[PDB]
Design a protein around this nucleic acid. Structure first.
Ligand SMILES: [K+]
Ligand SMILES: [Mg+2]
Ligand SMILES: [Mg+2]
Ligand SMILES: [Mg+2]
Ligand SMILES: [Mg+2]
Ligand SMILES: [Mg+2]
Ligand SMILES: [Mg+2]
Ligand SMILES: [Mg+2]
Ligand SMILES: [Mg+2]
Ligand SMILES: [Mg+2]
Ligand SMILES: [Mg+2]
Ligand SMILES: [Mg+2]
Ligand SMILES: [Mg+2]
Ligand SMILES: [Mg+2]
Ligand SMILES: [Mg+2]
Ligand SMILES: [Mg+2]
Ligand SMILES: [Mg+2]
Ligand SMILES: [Mg+2]
Ligand SMILES: [Mg+2]
Ligand SMILES: [Mg+2]
Ligand SMILES: [Mg+2]
Ligand SMILES: [Mg+2]
Ligand SMILES: [Mg+2]
Ligand SMILES: [Mg+2]
Ligand SMILES: [Mg+2]
Ligand SMILES: [Mg+2]
Ligand SMILES: [Mg+2]
Ligand SMILES: [Mg+2]
Ligand SMILES: [Mg+2]
Ligand SMILES: [Mg+2]
Ligand SMILES: [Mg+2]
Ligand SMILES: [Mg+2]
Ligand SMILES: [Mg+2]
Ligand SMILES: [Mg+2]
Lengths: 122, 137, 72, 74, 48, 128, 58, 86, 23, 97
RNA sequence: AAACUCCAGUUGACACAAAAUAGACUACGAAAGUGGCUUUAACAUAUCUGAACACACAAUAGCUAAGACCCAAACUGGGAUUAGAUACCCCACUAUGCUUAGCCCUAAACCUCAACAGUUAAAUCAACAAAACUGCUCGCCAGAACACUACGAGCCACAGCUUAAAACUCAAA
């Protein structure tokens, strides 16, 4: 079904980052995925230090990859992202828009529990 | 401006100064208040040791070390050796919930040092090593 | 009661007015009660639309000098 | 306690008796000991308030039933 | 209705043709998922 | 197994789906769906092969066919996960429940019982 | 707001395992706990330490 | 070890009043439950014992919050006797 | 309830295990 | 008979059911600014529903979203993001008093 | 006191271990169990009850074979306490707790409160505990101790488990 790849890339120059995004997308297409949209949330300092491929990363660029792939394509893509040295962190999750939020009527007050003990005169 | 209890961010620009030194350049006074002993070490911003003191190095041994007055004695001594190297303002990073958690900080104040920030860095594992078994007291 | 729906709508749109209730008087008629009486009379004409009937009832009290300050 | 003053005055005006104070135990069931061997118990008890100050049934309500004394209670 | 809606969306998707151009477009544009909530339920947008 | 190019059960009857782009057809196929949606087509295939009225979902034949599809999934699920104890009990209860359904169907409608066994490849055995 | 007590205790109606196992019935008493006296602590230790420090020096 | 330092659980001392800052830091740790967490982590609490302690605290919280509500509810009756002598 | 019944089985089981271990 | 007898109805004065501040709004693990509004500014501890005031459904959503963001490099764990320290205050908690 | 001093404090690198806060939530699973994150598969039955001759599971501890080493820790060693201390306190360390495969089949496996369908009326009801009952079915129980035992039988179990007596004894338990 529809997935979302929370992709955090190493802070590099424009030609290097652009090559990395294309290379990552081609990996999905090589595994039967149908890429929907490529989003750019910007680049900000990582909340905590991340070590990957014997490299210490303090900053990284944020990107989101939306694609349609079979269930078996999810496992293969995770293995691919680990071997990529330019990817700080890559996680594959369900697209939050696929899930439909059920309408909420509100908040029902909870009455105090009653008849928890016998009415005998202790 | 109104005082803010939150420390200034090193990346951001702040107008707060202490003797011409910014918050990131203030030497740090780490305090390790264990249940039986208190170890105080003062280091500068570049992780350069400046002064170190403890109850065991200030005429207290065995159960006497695990007392507030013993920690206070170490705090005064730690301030004295730090003050020789030009330390005036310190940032306190207290670790542990021992009896000398606050008294050791008092020794630094009475020794001629100024406290500008207090930080607690007690190690709390988030699930980690299984601690020792309960005592059958 | 049937008029309780009218009171709920009146308190929702206008709210309690500056006039104070006097429960001592057995024949006391509040602004909300006066609104209900006009609402009942205009209903007997043949109006069956709640929205149209509600607005017309408010206009009648305004023509009679009743102050009707809405919450908005 | 709010209407204790009123009830006592009403009883005096109509020539009847009122007990608006704390009800000592045995005023009805053990009346022959508290007052005397020849005491006469009330032939009718009227409760203007059937609950005590802890929101529980008045003791005299149960006691009057024991002494086969009819009760009129609000 | 959903099939018709979904059919139109594919016309502006990423394929092996619109790969380089779409990558460069992302590197120039930005987005802000982050938003805040008040005590009244009002949504506050980040002004950047 | 149904071909991986087969559309979903919900979208198999929408008009004009034969003239949509091949990209949309791939999305609406079984390839871009989970395993449960595949079982719907598998159950539907038998619901028309065997049941005289495929639209009746409360008949004994529909229940056996629906339960048979679940039993097949557990066998596939336990094939990959040999130490999954939770599904092993579910497999063993579903097998026992199907036999109870087979017993009731055989004792009331024997002619359809032959068709159910033939269609699903079920060899009914009397208990020891 | 008081935590709910619906389904917490093991009862006849409750199908689930109990959430709370109170050693006493959850019924409000007619009395509250008496005020607890503050534990005694050593006082004027700082002043004593300063006074005794000069004695060692003098 | 991998987060930025001098941000978490840091209190700035105002005008050299270290006593107020330390109490503020102590209260923040207590409110977030860090102080109570550290003490119970000194010696391992077995899962059977932890559930018994949690159930006791949860039952304690229910009684404490219910009794507190009644005290506030009846506090308006703490006035003087309006029917003195009756 | 007291554990008097359990204690009797506790001692019987303990002596049985020692007897089994002994012989 | 008598037309003044009470009739059977639902409560017309029944106020609408109260809703949490996040009712009807999506919660996303990438929405760090929203998530940081429900953690302590000094420890990063996730506030309880008695503090945030959220309902049961959104309290679970925020907790799940925070945990996902922390492991995926979107939300700091030990502290609250300083850039979000100036957000509107929606948690009923006071430290300095 | 012993131990350590190849130590401690600050900083950086850095798991086959364990999962703060949320959780004042009360959800899931047949029970046992289940509370870090992601993905896959997936949570039996369109009447109910029903196998202690059946099948599939069953916390922890333990056996078997190959690995992992942080911490905790039977036994053991050292230090102390004590009339003695084969314990409680302190320190060091092993089996073990983890992973893979195969076993073992026990628990206060207890929410000691059977499954389904109902009722809140009468006599509500020994006591206490967690109010009293109806219909139906299955399992189980008939004084205490001997006895979670002997013998027989079955079991990958061999110091084991399951099933389970008798004689003598007591007038109580
Ligand atoms: K955790
Ligand atoms: Mg359940
Ligand atoms: Mg008890
Ligand atoms: Mg108290
Ligand atoms: Mg780490
Ligand atoms: Mg007892
Ligand atoms: Mg014996
Ligand atoms: Mg020594
Ligand atoms: Mg270190
Ligand atoms: Mg683990
Ligand atoms: Mg685990
Ligand atoms: Mg907790
Ligand atoms: Mg998970
Ligand atoms: Mg999962
Ligand atoms: Mg089920
Ligand atoms: Mg059955
Ligand atoms: Mg087992
Ligand atoms: Mg084991
Ligand atoms: Mg052996
Ligand atoms: Mg081994
Ligand atoms: Mg160790
Ligand atoms: Mg050894
Ligand atoms: Mg020894
Ligand atoms: Mg070991
Ligand atoms: Mg259990
Ligand atoms: Mg039992
Ligand atoms: Mg049964
Ligand atoms: Mg029932
Ligand atoms: Mg009784
Ligand atoms: Mg046994
Ligand atoms: Mg035996
Ligand atoms: Mg025999
Ligand atoms: Mg034998
Ligand atoms: Mg058994």
């Amino acid at each position: 079904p529809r997935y979302e790849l929370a992709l955090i890339l190493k802070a590099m120059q424009r030609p290097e980052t652009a090559a990395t995004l294309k290379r990552t997308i081609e990996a999905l297409m090589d595994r039967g995925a149908i890429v929907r949209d490529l989003e750019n949330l910007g680049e900000r300092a990582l909340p905590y230090r991340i070590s990957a491929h014997s490299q210490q990363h303090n900053r990284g660029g944020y990107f989101l990859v939306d694609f349609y792939a079979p269930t078996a394509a999810v496992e293969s893509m995770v293995e691919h992202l680990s071997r990529d040295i330019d990817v700080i962190r890559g996680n594959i999750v369900k697209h939050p828009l696929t899930q439909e939020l059920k309408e909420c009527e509100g908040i029902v007050p909870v009455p105090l529990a009653e008849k928890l003990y016998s009415t005998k005169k202790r | 401006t109104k005082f803010s209890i939150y420390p200034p961010i090193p990346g951001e620009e702040s107008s707060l100064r202490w003797a011409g030194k910014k918050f990131e350049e203030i030497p740090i006074a780490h305090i390790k208040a264990s249940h039986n002993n208190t170890q105080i070490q003062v280091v500068s911003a570049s992780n350069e040791p400046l002064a170190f003191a403890s109850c065991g190095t200030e005429g207290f041994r065995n159960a006497k070390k695990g007392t507030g007055i013993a920690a206070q004695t170490a705090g005064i001594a730690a301030a004295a050796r730090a003050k020789q190297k030009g330390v005036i303002h310190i940032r306190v990073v207290v670790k542990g919930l021992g009896p000398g958690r606050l008294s050791a900080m008092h020794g630094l104040i009475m020794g001629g040092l100024e406290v500008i920030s207090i930080t607690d860095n007690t190690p709390i594992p988030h699930x980690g090593c299984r601690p020792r078994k309960a005592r059958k007291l | 009661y049937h008029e309780d729906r009218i009171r709920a709508k009146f308190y929702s749109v206008y709210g309690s007015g500056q006039r104070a209730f006097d429960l001592f008087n057995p024949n006391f008629k509040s602004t909300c009660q006066r609104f209900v009486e006009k609402y009942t009379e205009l209903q007997k004409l043949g109006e069956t639309d709640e929205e149209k009937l509600f607005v017309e009832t408010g206009k009648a009290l305004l023509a009679e000098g009743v102050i009707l300050r809405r919450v908005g | 306690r709010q209407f204790s003053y009123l009830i006592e005055n009403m009883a005096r005006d109509c020539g009847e008796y009122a007990h608006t104070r704390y009800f000592r135990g045995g005023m009805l069931t053990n009346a022959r000991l508290l007052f005397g061997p020849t005491v006469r118990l009330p032939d009718l008890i009227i409760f203007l308030h059937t609950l005590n100050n802890i929101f529980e049934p008045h003791v005299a309500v149960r006691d009057a039933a024991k002494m086969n004394i009819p009760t009129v209670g609000i | 209705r959903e099939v018709l809606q979904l059919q139109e969306e594919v016309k502006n998707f990423i394929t092996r043709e619109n790969l380089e151009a779409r990558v460069e477009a992302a590197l120039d544009s930005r987005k802000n998922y982050n938003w805040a909530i008040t005590r009244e339920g009002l949504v506050v947008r980040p002004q950047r | 197994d149904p071909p991986p190019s087969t559309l979903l059960k919900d979208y198999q009857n929408v008009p004009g789906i034969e003239k949509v782009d091949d990209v949309v057809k791939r999305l609406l196929s079984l390839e871009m769906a989970n395993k449960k949606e595949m079982l719907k087509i598998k159950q539907e295939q038998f619901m028309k092969k065997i049941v005289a009225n495929p639209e009746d979902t409360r008949s004994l034949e529909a229940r056996i066919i629906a339960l048979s599809v679940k039993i097949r999934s557990y066998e596939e699920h336990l094939e990959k996960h040999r130490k999954d104890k939770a599904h092993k009990r579910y497999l063993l209860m579903s097998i026992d429940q199907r036999k109870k359904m087979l017993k009731n169907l055989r004792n009331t409608n024997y002619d359809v019982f032959e068709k159910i066994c033939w269609g699903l490849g079920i060899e009914y055995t009397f208990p020891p | 707001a008081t935590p709910s007590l619906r389904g917490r205790l093991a009862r006849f109606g409750n199908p689930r395992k109990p959430v709370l196992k109170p050693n006493k019935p959850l019924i409000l008493a007619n009395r509250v706990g008496e005020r607890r006296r503050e534990k005694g602590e050593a006082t004027c230790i700082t002043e004593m330490s300063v006074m005794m420090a000069c004695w060692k020096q003098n | 070890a991998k987060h930025l330092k001098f941000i978490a659980r840091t209190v700035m001392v105002q005008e050299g009043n270290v006593e107020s800052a330390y109490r503020t830091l102590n209260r923040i740790l207590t409110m977030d439950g860090l102080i109570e967490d550290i003490k119970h982590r000194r010696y391992y609490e077995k899962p059977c014992r932890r559930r018994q302690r949690e159930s006791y605290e949860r039952c304690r919280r229910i009684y404490n919050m219910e009794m507190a509500r009644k005290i506030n509810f009846l506090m308006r009756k703490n006035r003087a006797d309006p029917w003195q002598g009756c | 309830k007291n554990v008097l019944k359990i204690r009797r089985r506790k001692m019987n089981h303990h002596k049985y295990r020692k007897l089994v271990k002994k012989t | 008979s008598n037309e003044d007898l009470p009739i059977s109805m639902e409560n017309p004065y029944k106020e609408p059911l109260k809703k949490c501040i996040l009712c009807g709004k999506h919660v996303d693990y990438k929405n760090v600014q929203l998530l940081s509004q429900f953690v302590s500014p000094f420890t990063g501890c996730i506030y309880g529903r008695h503090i945030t005031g959220l309902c049961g459904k959104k309290q679970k959503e925020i907790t799940k979203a925070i945990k996902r963001a922390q492991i995926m490099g979107f939300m700091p764990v030990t502290y609250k993001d300083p850039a979000y320290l100036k957000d509107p205050k929606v948690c009923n908690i006071r430290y300095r008093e």
